[PDB]
RNA sequence: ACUUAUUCAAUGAAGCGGAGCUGGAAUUCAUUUUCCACGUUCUAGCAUUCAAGGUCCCAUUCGGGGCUGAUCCGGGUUGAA
RNA sequence: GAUGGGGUCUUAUGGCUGGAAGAGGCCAGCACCUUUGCUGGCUCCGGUGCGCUUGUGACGGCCCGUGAAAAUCCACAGGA
RNA sequence: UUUAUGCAGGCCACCAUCGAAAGGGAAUCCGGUUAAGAUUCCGGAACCUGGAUAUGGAUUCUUCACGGUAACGUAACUGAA
C-alpha cells in the first residue's frame, strides 16, 4: 500500500502553514523585572487583522527600561480594547480589561485570556476567538491557581503565570455558516493545505484502510486503538464511546 | 520618490515648525497641550500627595 | 546618503582647514 | 550656583531609563569559564572520600614562608652556573687529574615525582612537600600514605607553581629535602616538629572524614530558614 | 526530602537570595516578636549624552578624577523538574 | 463648529515660454553625366462626446479572504 | 605629527551567502544616419551618482535667517551619538 495522506502530512512539504501575511507570533511581554515587582505601561497603537487567525491583534508599545528605545509587543486583542488605550502589565497592575496581571493577584471568577502555562512562555492558553479561562480558586500555600479551560478541563498552574484580563475578541465567528466551498477555500488558503478532504472510503485500498469494495463501506470497526501505528490511525483514535452524544457528558 | 528627496532642498521637505515634515499641525498642537496640561497635573499631584502625608 | 554626505562634508572641511593652516 | 538645578531622576520601575550598573553577576561567560567554575562547585557538592580532602588542609602561610625560605638555600644549579662549574672541573682534571671531585658535594632539593617516590621508598627523604593543585590528583593521592608508612614527614603545600619557581621550572608538583647541612638542621627539626603535628599525627583522623557536601548560598539560606521554621517552641 | 548528575524553557543571561535602612499595622510584658510595604494609573505628549545636584582631591583653564545620588554581602543568569 | 466670506497646500495633470524651428512635414521654382543639390513659401485657428483605449482621483461594495519583504532615500526629536 | 597608525577615547550588537532579465530599483529625450546597429552611433538639448573644489549669493557684533493671526512661504538660512 501507499503512504496515506495523514501519514504524508508530517513531512511538511506542501502541508506547512502559509505564513507570508502574518504580523508575527502574538506573544506576551517578557517577565523581566517590572512585571514581577511592579507594573509597566504601554499603549495600544493599532488593532490590526491577522491572516489565518480569527482574533484581531493589538500592537502595544512599551518603553525599554534599560535602553532609550521603544519595544513593540503583539498581543491578542481582548474584547473592548481600543486604540490609544493604556495597557498596564505587572504584579501591581490594576484589574482592568487588557491588563496582564499575574494569576496570583486576581480574585476568583476573574475572566482572563492568553494565559501562560509556566511563567515565561508568553501566552499559551485561551488564544482563539471568543475563548477565555476562568479562575476557580487559589492555593497560597503551594502557590498554584486552579483554572477552568475552554474545554471544561481543570488545570493547576503557577500563581506567577500571567494572563490578559477579558475575552479574546472576534467571538461568535463560527456561528455564521460559510455557505460556500469558496469561503472555506479562502479560509484555508491562508492557514494550510488541508482542504478539500477526500473520504477514505471513496479511495482505493492502496490509498486508505477504508478504501475498496464493491460498495463504499469501512469494513472493520472505525475505532482504532491508541497503540496502533502510523498508517492504521485512520478513523476514531482511542474512542471511549461513539455515536450521538445524548445527555450530559459527566464532565 | 524617496531617492529624489536627496536632490531637493530643505524647503521642499519641511515646514518651519517643530515636527515640521514629520507630524501634522493639529497633532503638534494637541501634543503640546497634553504635555503642558499633564505636567501641571503632575505638579499638583506632587504637592497634594506630599501635604497629606506631611500632615499625617 | 546623509552618511557619505556627512563624511564628504567633514572631508571638505578638513581639507579646507588643512590647506589654510600652512 | 544660581544657574544649576537639582533634577534628580526617578529611577523607579516605569519612571526613567536605568543607569549603567555593575552587571558582573549576570555576565554570560564563555564555556571555559563556566566549566572551570562549575567543576570546583561540583567538587564540593559531592561527599569526597577522605583520601581527597586529606588534601585541602594546607600549610599555613607563616610556616610556608619559613619553609620556602629554608628550601631556597638549597636550590638546584642553573644552566650558567652548571656550565662554569663543569669548565672548572675540566680545568681541574686537566691540571690535577682529580676524579671529578674538585667540585664539592652538592646540597640541592630533590624533585621529580618518580625520583622522590624512590627516595621515600629508600627512606632517604628528610622532608617532603606535596603540591595541592595537581590536576590528576591520583598522581599524589598515594604520597601521604606512603610517607606515613615509610615514616618520612610530609606537608601538603599550596602551589606547584611555587615549587616550580623553587626548582627553576614552571611546576614541580613535589619537592623533597633528603640531606641538609649542619647550619640549619635544627631549623629543619623545629619545622618538622610542627609539620608532622599538622599532617602525620592527624592522618589517622583525616582518613575517616568525608569532605565536601557543602550547599550553595541560596540553598544554605533555604535550609536554615527551614531550621528556624522548625525551631518554634 | 535535598541538589550537583540528567531533563525542560527564556533572556542582548538586568535586578536572584540573604541581611539592613525608612514608613504602616503590631503586643510589646522589657525591648521589641513579627507581618506588610520599601518613587510610576483621569489624558494616543516627553523621557538617551559615564546624570543634574552635593561632597572630596588635582593644580585650574580649556577642565579631569573619586564617592554619593542609586544600602551592603554572596559572583548560583533566572525559573521548573 | 456647518453653510457662507477670505486664504493655505500637494503639482497627478493641463496652459504659456524656453528646448524649437534652425528640426520634421507639405508644396513651388531653378537646375544637371555628375558629389547632385540650390532658392523660395506654408506648417494656422477651432468644436464636440454615456465614444474607444489608457492613466489617475474622490468614493462606494465584498471577505471566518482585509489583500509581500528587504535594500534604499528623506524628515523630525535631541543638543555633542 | 621618531610615525605609522598604534596608543587617547567614544558608539554599535545585526550576526555568512545565494535566490526575480515580469517584484523593488538613481539618472535621456528629439531629429538624422547603415546593405545589415541604435533610447547605444552623429548633431543638439538634458539628467543622476561619486569625487574634488573656488567664486558669487545667503547668514553673523542679538553668532547658527526672516515673513505670515494661522494653515504655511522662500534661493540659501550649522546640527554628532
Ligand atoms: Mg488543498
Ligand atoms: Mg469529503
Ligand atoms: Mg474508485
Ligand atoms: Mg492496507
Ligand atoms: Mg472498503
Ligand atoms: Mg465502486
Ligand atoms: Mg516645505
Ligand atoms: Mg536572564
Ligand atoms: Mg467651512
Ligand atoms: Mg509632471
Ligand atoms: Mg488592458
Ligand atoms: Mg542577490
Ligand atoms: Mg530586477
Ligand atoms: Mg523590475
Ligand atoms: Mg510589489
Ligand atoms: Mg533593426
Ligand atoms: Mg550623443
Ligand atoms: Mg533670507
Ligand atoms: Zn497629524
CSV table of N, CA, C and O (backbone and C1' of nucleotides) in Angstrom, one decimal, chain E residues 23-76:
chain,number,residue,atom,x,y,z
E,23,G,P,11.0,56.5,60.0
E,23,G,O5',9.6,56.6,59.3
E,23,G,C5',8.5,56.0,59.7
E,23,G,C4',7.5,55.7,58.6
E,23,G,C3',6.3,54.8,58.9
E,23,G,O3',5.3,55.5,59.6
E,23,G,C1',7.3,54.1,56.9
E,24,G,P,4.8,55.1,61.1
E,24,G,O5',3.4,54.3,60.9
E,24,G,C5',2.5,54.7,59.9
E,24,G,C4',1.7,53.5,59.3
E,24,G,C3',1.3,52.4,60.3
E,24,G,O3',0.1,52.7,61.0
E,24,G,C1',2.3,51.5,58.4
E,25,A,P,0.1,52.7,62.6
E,25,A,O5',-0.5,51.3,63.0
E,25,A,C5',-1.7,50.8,62.5
E,25,A,C4',-1.7,49.4,62.1
E,25,A,C3',-1.5,48.4,63.2
E,25,A,O3',-2.8,48.1,63.8
E,25,A,C1',-0.1,47.8,61.4
E,26,A,P,-2.9,47.9,65.4
E,26,A,O5',-1.7,46.9,65.8
E,26,A,C5',-1.8,45.5,65.5
E,26,A,C4',-0.6,44.8,65.8
E,26,A,C3',0.0,45.1,67.2
E,26,A,O3',-0.5,44.3,68.2
E,26,A,C1',1.7,45.3,65.5
E,27,U,P,-1.6,45.0,69.2
E,27,U,O5',-2.0,43.8,70.2
E,27,U,C5',-1.4,42.5,70.2
E,27,U,C4',-0.4,42.2,71.3
E,27,U,C3',-0.6,43.1,72.5
E,27,U,O3',-0.5,42.3,73.7
E,27,U,C1',1.6,43.5,71.6
E,28,U,P,0.9,41.6,74.3
E,28,U,O5',1.8,42.9,74.7
E,28,U,C5',3.1,42.7,75.3
E,28,U,C4',4.2,42.8,74.3
E,28,U,C3',5.6,43.0,74.9
E,28,U,O3',6.6,42.2,74.2
E,28,U,C1',5.1,44.7,73.4
E,29,C,P,6.9,40.7,74.6
E,29,C,O5',6.3,40.6,76.1
E,29,C,C5',7.2,40.3,77.3
E,29,C,C4',7.2,41.5,78.3
E,29,C,C3',7.2,41.1,79.7
E,29,C,O3',7.9,42.1,80.5
E,29,C,C1',5.3,42.4,79.3
E,30,A,P,9.4,41.8,81.1
E,30,A,O5',10.2,41.3,79.8
E,30,A,C5',11.6,41.6,79.7
E,30,A,C4',11.9,42.5,78.6
E,30,A,C3',13.1,43.4,78.7
E,30,A,O3',13.7,43.6,77.4
E,30,A,C1',11.3,44.8,78.6
E,31,U,P,14.7,42.5,76.8
E,31,U,O5',15.5,43.3,75.6
E,31,U,C5',15.8,44.7,75.7
E,31,U,C4',15.2,45.5,74.6
E,31,U,C3',14.9,46.9,74.9
E,31,U,O3',15.3,47.8,73.8
E,31,U,C1',12.9,45.7,74.3
E,32,U,P,14.7,47.8,72.3
E,32,U,O5',15.0,46.4,71.7
E,32,U,C5',14.3,45.8,70.6
E,32,U,C4',13.3,44.8,71.0
E,32,U,C3',13.0,43.6,70.1
E,32,U,O3',12.8,42.4,70.8
E,32,U,C1',11.0,44.7,70.6
E,33,U,P,13.3,41.0,70.2
E,33,U,O5',12.0,40.2,69.9
E,33,U,C5',11.7,39.8,68.6
E,33,U,C4',10.5,38.9,68.5
E,33,U,C3',10.0,38.6,67.1
E,33,U,O3',10.7,37.5,66.5
E,33,U,C1',8.1,39.2,68.5
E,34,U,P,11.6,37.8,65.2
E,34,U,O5',10.7,38.8,64.3
E,34,U,C5',10.1,38.4,63.1
E,34,U,C4',8.6,38.3,63.3
E,34,U,C3',7.8,38.7,62.1
E,34,U,O3',7.7,37.6,61.1
E,34,U,C1',6.9,39.7,64.0
E,35,C,P,8.1,37.8,59.6
E,35,C,O5',6.8,38.3,58.9
E,35,C,C5',5.5,37.7,59.2
E,35,C,C4',4.4,38.7,58.9
E,35,C,C3',4.5,39.5,57.6
E,35,C,O3',4.1,38.7,56.5
E,35,C,C1',3.9,40.9,59.3
E,36,C,P,4.4,39.2,55.0
E,36,C,O5',3.2,40.2,54.7
E,36,C,C5',3.3,41.1,53.6
E,36,C,C4',2.6,42.4,53.9
E,36,C,C3',3.0,43.6,53.0
E,36,C,O3',2.4,43.6,51.7
E,36,C,C1',3.0,44.3,55.3
E,37,A,P,3.2,43.4,50.4
E,37,A,O5',4.6,44.2,50.6
E,37,A,C5',5.0,45.2,49.7
E,37,A,C4',4.6,46.6,50.2
E,37,A,C3',5.5,47.7,49.8
E,37,A,O3',5.2,48.2,48.5
E,37,A,C1',5.1,47.8,52.1
E,38,C,P,5.7,49.6,48.0
E,38,C,O5',7.1,49.9,48.7
E,38,C,C5',7.5,51.2,49.1
E,38,C,C4',8.9,51.3,49.6
E,38,C,C3',10.0,50.8,48.6
E,38,C,O3',10.3,51.8,47.7
E,38,C,C1',10.4,50.0,50.8
E,39,G,P,9.7,51.8,46.2
E,39,G,O5',9.0,53.2,46.0
E,39,G,C5',8.4,53.5,44.7
E,39,G,C4',8.0,54.9,44.7
E,39,G,C3',7.4,55.4,43.3
E,39,G,O3',6.4,56.4,43.5
E,39,G,C1',9.3,56.7,43.9
E,40,U,P,4.8,55.9,43.5
E,40,U,O5',4.3,56.1,42.0
E,40,U,C5',4.9,57.2,41.2
E,40,U,C4',4.6,56.9,39.7
E,40,U,C3',3.3,56.3,39.4
E,40,U,O3',2.2,57.3,39.4
E,40,U,C1',5.0,55.3,38.1
E,41,U,P,0.8,56.9,40.0
E,41,U,O5',0.0,56.1,38.8
E,41,U,C5',-0.1,56.7,37.5
E,41,U,C4',-1.5,56.6,37.0
E,41,U,C3',-2.6,56.8,38.0
E,41,U,O3',-3.7,57.5,37.4
E,41,U,C1',-2.9,54.8,36.9
E,42,C,P,-3.9,59.1,37.8
E,42,C,O5',-5.1,59.5,36.8
E,42,C,C5',-5.1,59.2,35.5
E,42,C,C4',-6.5,59.2,34.9
E,42,C,C3',-6.6,59.4,33.4
E,42,C,O3',-6.5,58.2,32.7
E,42,C,C1',-8.2,60.7,34.6
E,43,U,P,-5.2,57.9,31.8
E,43,U,O5',-5.3,58.9,30.6
E,43,U,C5',-6.4,58.9,29.7
E,43,U,C4',-6.4,60.1,28.8
E,43,U,C3',-5.2,60.2,27.9
E,43,U,O3',-5.6,60.8,26.6
E,43,U,C1',-5.4,62.1,29.3
E,44,A,P,-5.9,59.8,25.4
E,44,A,O5',-4.4,59.7,24.7
E,44,A,C5',-3.5,58.8,25.1
E,44,A,C4',-2.4,58.5,24.1
E,44,A,C3',-1.7,59.7,23.5
E,44,A,O3',-0.3,59.5,23.3
E,44,A,C1',-2.7,58.5,21.8
E,45,G,P,0.7,59.5,24.5
E,45,G,O5',1.8,60.5,24.0
E,45,G,C5',1.5,61.5,23.1
E,45,G,C4',2.4,62.7,23.2
E,45,G,C3',3.8,62.5,23.6
E,45,G,O3',4.6,62.1,22.5
E,45,G,C1',3.0,64.2,24.9
E,46,C,P,5.8,61.0,22.7
E,46,C,O5',6.8,61.8,23.6
E,46,C,C5',7.6,62.9,23.2
E,46,C,C4',8.4,63.5,24.3
E,46,C,C3',9.4,62.5,24.9
E,46,C,O3',10.7,62.5,24.2
E,46,C,C1',8.2,63.6,26.6
E,47,A,P,11.6,61.2,24.2
E,47,A,O5',12.2,61.1,25.7
E,47,A,C5',13.1,62.1,26.1
E,47,A,C4',13.2,62.1,27.6
E,47,A,C3',14.1,61.0,28.2
E,47,A,O3',14.7,61.4,29.4
E,47,A,C1',11.9,60.7,29.0
E,48,U,P,16.2,62.0,29.3
E,48,U,O5',17.0,60.9,28.4
E,48,U,C5',17.4,59.7,28.9
E,48,U,C4',18.5,59.1,28.1
E,48,U,C3',19.7,60.0,27.7
E,48,U,O3',20.7,60.0,28.8
E,48,U,C1',19.0,58.9,25.8
E,49,U,P,21.3,61.3,29.4
E,49,U,O5',22.8,61.4,28.8
E,49,U,C5',23.6,60.3,28.6
E,49,U,C4',24.8,60.6,27.8
E,49,U,C3',25.7,61.7,28.2
E,49,U,O3',27.0,61.4,28.0
E,49,U,C1',24.9,62.2,26.0
E,50,C,P,28.1,61.5,29.2
E,50,C,O5',27.6,60.4,30.2
E,50,C,C5',27.4,59.1,29.8
E,50,C,C4',27.8,58.1,30.9
E,50,C,C3',27.5,58.5,32.3
E,50,C,O3',26.1,58.3,32.7
E,50,C,C1',29.7,57.8,32.3
E,51,A,P,25.5,58.8,34.0
E,51,A,O5',24.2,59.6,33.5
E,51,A,C5',24.3,60.7,32.6
E,51,A,C4',23.7,62.0,33.1
E,51,A,C3',24.7,62.9,33.7
E,51,A,O3',24.3,64.3,33.5
E,51,A,C1',23.1,62.3,35.3
E,52,A,P,25.4,65.5,33.4
E,52,A,O5',24.7,66.7,34.0
E,52,A,C5',24.9,67.0,35.4
E,52,A,C4',23.7,67.7,36.0
E,52,A,C3',23.9,68.3,37.4
E,52,A,O3',24.5,69.6,37.4
E,52,A,C1',22.0,67.0,37.4
E,53,G,P,25.7,70.0,38.3
E,53,G,O5',25.1,69.9,39.8
E,53,G,C5',24.1,70.8,40.2
E,53,G,C4',23.4,70.4,41.4
E,53,G,C3',24.3,70.2,42.7
E,53,G,O3',24.4,71.4,43.4
E,53,G,C1',23.0,68.2,42.4
E,54,G,P,25.9,71.9,43.9
E,54,G,O5',26.1,71.0,45.2
E,54,G,C5',25.2,70.9,46.2
E,54,G,C4',25.5,69.8,47.2
E,54,G,C3',26.9,69.6,47.6
E,54,G,O3',27.3,70.5,48.6
E,54,G,C1',26.0,67.5,47.0
E,55,U,P,28.7,71.2,48.6
E,55,U,O5',29.7,70.1,49.0
E,55,U,C5',29.5,69.4,50.2
E,55,U,C4',30.3,68.1,50.2
E,55,U,C3',31.8,68.2,49.9
E,55,U,O3',32.6,68.6,51.0
E,55,U,C1',30.8,66.4,48.7
E,56,C,P,33.9,69.5,50.7
E,56,C,O5',35.0,68.5,50.3
E,56,C,C5',35.3,67.4,51.1
E,56,C,C4',36.3,66.4,50.4
E,56,C,C3',37.4,67.1,49.7
E,56,C,O3',38.5,67.4,50.5
E,56,C,C1',36.5,65.4,48.3
E,57,C,P,39.7,68.3,50.0
E,57,C,O5',40.7,67.3,49.4
E,57,C,C5',41.7,67.7,48.4
E,57,C,C4',42.0,66.6,47.4
E,57,C,C3',42.8,67.0,46.2
E,57,C,O3',44.2,67.1,46.5
E,57,C,C1',41.0,65.7,45.5
E,58,C,P,45.0,68.5,46.1
E,58,C,O5',45.4,68.3,44.6
E,58,C,C5',46.0,67.1,44.1
E,58,C,C4',45.8,66.8,42.7
E,58,C,C3',46.4,67.7,41.7
E,58,C,O3',46.9,67.1,40.5
E,58,C,C1',44.1,67.6,41.3
E,59,A,P,48.0,67.7,39.6
E,59,A,O5',47.2,68.7,38.6
E,59,A,C5',47.9,69.9,38.1
E,59,A,C4',47.0,71.1,38.2
E,59,A,C3',47.6,72.5,38.0
E,59,A,O3',46.6,73.4,37.5
E,59,A,C1',46.9,72.2,40.2
E,60,U,P,46.9,74.7,36.8
E,60,U,O5',46.1,75.8,37.6
E,60,U,C5',45.8,77.1,37.0
E,60,U,C4',44.3,77.0,36.5
E,60,U,C3',43.3,77.8,37.2
E,60,U,O3',42.3,78.2,36.2
E,60,U,C1',42.8,75.5,37.4
E,61,U,P,42.3,79.8,35.7
E,61,U,O5',41.9,79.7,34.2
E,61,U,C5',40.6,79.5,33.8
E,61,U,C4',40.4,78.4,32.9
E,61,U,C3',39.9,77.1,33.5
E,61,U,O3',39.0,76.4,32.6
E,61,U,C1',41.9,76.7,32.4
E,62,C,P,37.5,76.7,32.6
E,62,C,O5',37.1,77.0,31.0
E,62,C,C5',38.2,77.1,30.0
E,62,C,C4',38.1,76.0,29.1
E,62,C,C3',38.1,74.6,29.7
E,62,C,O3',37.3,73.7,28.9
E,62,C,C1',40.0,74.8,28.5
E,63,G,P,35.7,73.6,29.1
E,63,G,O5',35.5,72.1,29.7
E,63,G,C5',35.8,71.8,31.1
E,63,G,C4',37.2,71.1,31.2
E,63,G,C3',37.1,69.8,31.9
E,63,G,O3',36.7,68.7,31.0
E,63,G,C1',38.8,71.1,32.8
E,64,G,P,35.9,67.5,31.6
E,64,G,O5',36.9,66.7,32.4
E,64,G,C5',38.1,66.1,31.8
E,64,G,C4',39.0,65.5,32.8
E,64,G,C3',38.4,64.5,33.7
E,64,G,O3',38.2,63.2,33.2
E,64,G,C1',39.8,66.0,34.9
E,65,G,P,37.0,62.3,33.6
E,65,G,O5',37.4,61.7,35.1
E,65,G,C5',38.6,61.0,35.2
E,65,G,C4',39.0,60.8,36.6
E,65,G,C3',38.0,60.3,37.6
E,65,G,O3',37.8,58.9,37.5
E,65,G,C1',39.1,62.1,38.6
E,66,G,P,36.3,58.3,37.8
E,66,G,O5',36.2,58.2,39.4
E,66,G,C5',37.2,57.5,40.1
E,66,G,C4',37.1,57.8,41.6
E,66,G,C3',35.8,57.6,42.3
E,66,G,O3',35.5,56.2,42.6
E,66,G,C1',36.7,59.6,43.0
E,67,C,P,34.0,55.7,42.4
E,67,C,O5',33.2,56.2,43.7
E,67,C,C5',33.7,55.8,45.0
E,67,C,C4',33.1,56.7,46.1
E,67,C,C3',31.5,56.7,46.1
E,67,C,O3',31.0,55.6,46.7
E,67,C,C1',32.4,58.9,46.3
E,68,U,P,29.6,55.0,46.2
E,68,U,O5',28.5,56.1,46.6
E,68,U,C5',28.1,56.4,47.9
E,68,U,C4',27.4,57.7,48.0
E,68,U,C3',26.0,57.7,47.3
E,68,U,O3',25.0,57.2,48.1
E,68,U,C1',27.3,59.7,46.8
E,69,G,P,23.7,56.4,47.4
E,69,G,O5',23.0,57.6,46.5
E,69,G,C5',22.2,58.6,47.1
E,69,G,C4',21.9,59.7,46.1
E,69,G,C3',21.1,59.3,44.9
E,69,G,O3',19.7,59.4,45.3
E,69,G,C1',23.0,60.5,44.2
E,70,A,P,18.7,58.2,44.8
E,70,A,O5',19.5,56.9,45.3
E,70,A,C5',18.8,55.6,45.3
E,70,A,C4',19.6,54.5,44.7
E,70,A,C3',20.9,54.2,45.4
E,70,A,O3',21.2,52.8,45.3
E,70,A,C1',21.2,54.7,43.1
E,71,U,P,20.9,51.9,46.5
E,71,U,O5',22.2,52.0,47.4
E,71,U,C5',22.3,52.8,48.6
E,71,U,C4',22.8,52.1,49.8
E,71,U,C3',23.7,50.9,49.5
E,71,U,O3',25.0,51.2,49.2
E,71,U,C1',22.1,50.4,51.2
E,72,C,P,26.0,50.1,48.7
E,72,C,O5',26.7,49.5,50.0
E,72,C,C5',27.5,48.4,50.0
E,72,C,C4',27.3,47.5,51.2
E,72,C,C3',27.6,46.1,51.0
E,72,C,O3',29.0,45.8,51.1
E,72,C,C1',25.5,46.2,52.0
E,73,C,P,29.8,45.1,50.0
E,73,C,O5',29.6,43.5,50.3
E,73,C,C5',29.8,43.0,51.6
E,73,C,C4',29.2,41.7,51.8
E,73,C,C3',29.3,40.7,50.7
E,73,C,O3',30.6,40.0,50.8
E,73,C,C1',27.1,40.8,51.4
E,74,G,P,31.3,39.5,49.5
E,74,G,O5',30.4,38.2,49.0
E,74,G,C5',30.3,37.1,49.9
E,74,G,C4',29.4,36.1,49.3
E,74,G,C3',29.6,35.8,47.8
E,74,G,O3',30.6,34.8,47.5
E,74,G,C1',27.3,36.1,48.2
E,75,G,P,32.0,35.2,47.0
E,75,G,O5',31.7,35.8,45.6
E,75,G,C5',31.5,34.9,44.5
E,75,G,C4',30.1,35.1,43.9
E,75,G,C3',29.7,34.0,42.9
E,75,G,O3',28.3,33.7,43.1
E,75,G,C1',29.6,36.2,41.9
E,76,G,P,28.0,32.4,44.0
E,76,G,O5',27.2,31.4,43.0
E,76,G,C5',27.6,31.3,41.6
E,76,G,C4',26.4,30.8,40.8
E,76,G,C3',25.4,31.9,40.4
E,76,G,O3',24.7,31.5,39.2
E,76,G,C1',24.3,30.3,41.8
